Design a protein around this ligand. Structure first.
Ligand code: OH
Ligand code: ZN
Ligand code: ZN
Length: 305
């Protein structure tokens, strides 16, 4: 049961996939599992849909683990999934959100790379797509989106960790999300989870031009970092991607924002470099707890209060 599943340790790809089947079996009144595509190697790509009814209700997209090595993200996603099922009908605020909006959660956005971090390279970041012309494998899925694709902030060299691929959406793991979100057409928030650095970022990453909704998103971001900090005092910096980290092209939130999805944010979770990607399992639950308060604040702003 999801009640005996250990949320305080890291899991394999199959354990997480089995957890998904368990959650759907236990809470059919709220969650269902969708296969939106298959990875380069043929692994199914799954999205959990949380909904209380309706026809094409406004939605919130949340993806985790696009960069496979960022294990704290998939772990936070599993906990989030459990959280949603416990809080509905309990937390008055979250209850109002699910009563008028659907939440789409993608725990393992890059399954091939995730399997690879467990079998061969713990620090693997990219997908596992093969390019016959190179001995190097993979494309950085967060440089593959049609948002300033091929511009500064990504590399054209296949061996680079930030290789953008041959063309925008070349990676099936990316195309499957683009297609799904576009066909859906009613997403109001697009949240992508990463690690590490402790930053809450909004568009743009590919250009220094300010998004027209700059002042609003910056206020929402300030509110979200305040709420997250309240719990354990964890401090986050926030701002546009280009001014807060560096210029980065072909990123997902830049693409989602240009698709009319206003509340597009990227979270860079714990820590700031002590452990980096190898965050100890003892910090899983705490990280998941604080990030939740931050995420919820953004959602309340999308239902509009
Ligand atoms: O990242
Ligand atoms: Zn990342
Ligand atoms: Zn990052």
């Amino acid at each position: 049961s999801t009640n005996t599943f250990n949320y305080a340790t890291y899991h394999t790809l199959d354990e997480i996939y089995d957890f998904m089947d368990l959650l759907v079996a236990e809470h059919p009144q709220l969650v269902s599992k969708l296969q939106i595509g298959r990875s380069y190697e043929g692994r199914p790509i799954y999205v959990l849909k949380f909904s209380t009814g309706g026809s094409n209700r406004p939605a919130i997209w949340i993806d985790l683990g696009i960069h496979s090595r960022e294990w704290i993200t998939q772990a936070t996603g599993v906990w989030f999934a459990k959280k949603f099922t416990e809080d509905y009908g309990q937390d008055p605020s979250f209850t109002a959100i699910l009563d008028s909006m659907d939440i789409f959660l993608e725990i393992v956005t890059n399954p091939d790379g995730f399997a690879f971090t467990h079998s061969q390279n713990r620090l693997w970041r990219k997908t596992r797509s093969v390019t016959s012309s190179s001995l190097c494998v993979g494309v950085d899925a967060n440089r593959n989106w049609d948002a300033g694709f091929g511009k500064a902030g990504a590399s054209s060299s296949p061996c680079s960790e930030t290789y953008h691929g041959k063309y925008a959406n070349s990676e099936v793991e990316v195309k499957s999300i683009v297609d799904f979100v576009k066909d859906h057409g009613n997403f109001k928030a697009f949240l992508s989870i990463h690690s590490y650095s402790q930053l809450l970022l909004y568009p743009y990453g590919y250009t220094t031009q300010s998004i027209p909704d700059k002042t609003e998103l910056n206020q929402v971001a300030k509110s979200a970092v305040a709420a997250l900090k309240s719990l354990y005092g964890t401090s986050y910096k926030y701002g546009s991607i280009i001014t807060t980290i560096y210029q980065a092209s072909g990123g997902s939130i830049d693409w989602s924002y240009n698709q009319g999805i206003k509340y597009s944010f990227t979270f860079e979770l714990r820590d700031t470099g002590r452990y980096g990607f190898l965050l100890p399992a003892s910090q899983i639950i705490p990280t998941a707890q604080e990030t939740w308060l931050g995420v919820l604040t953004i959602m309340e702003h999308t239902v509009n209060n």
